[PDB]
Q: What sequence folds into this?
């Protein structure tokens, strides 16, 4: 029984080691929008008679 | 005549999973006793706890 207890403790200590680490890389990436219409700023001004 | 051979249950090599799966270790015939991968939510675009 004492051998079993000792071996269990040793097995736990041996199993305590970790494999690896996973993570997501997302810094610096922003979302985007879509401008629907081109912003023209032209206005036509005409005289009443059209001269 | 008698049907000696007509198809049968077929064995396929690979079990391809379409659904994307999170990282893991071996758990089939080979079992990995080490600690499972540690998920860290690094690289936060906005500060929360600093």
A:
């Amino acid at each position: 029984e004492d051998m079993a207890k000792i071996y269990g403790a040793v097995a736990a200590v041996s199993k305590n080691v970790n494999s690896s680490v996973t993570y997501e890389v997302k810094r610096g990436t922003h979302e985007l929008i879509k401008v629907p219409t081109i912003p023209h700023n032209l206005v036509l001004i005409q005289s009443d008679n059209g001269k | 005549g008698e049907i000696i051979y007509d198809g049968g249950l077929s064995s396929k090599l690979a079990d391809v999973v379409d659904k994307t799966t999170e990282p893991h270790n071996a758990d089939g015939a080979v079992k990995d006793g080490r600690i499972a991968p540690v998920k860290l939510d690094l690289e936060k675009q906005k500060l929360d706890k600093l």
About this structure: The two ends of chain B are 82 Å apart (CA to CA). The first strand of chain B starts at residue 38 and ends at 39. DSSP finds no helices and one strand in chain B.
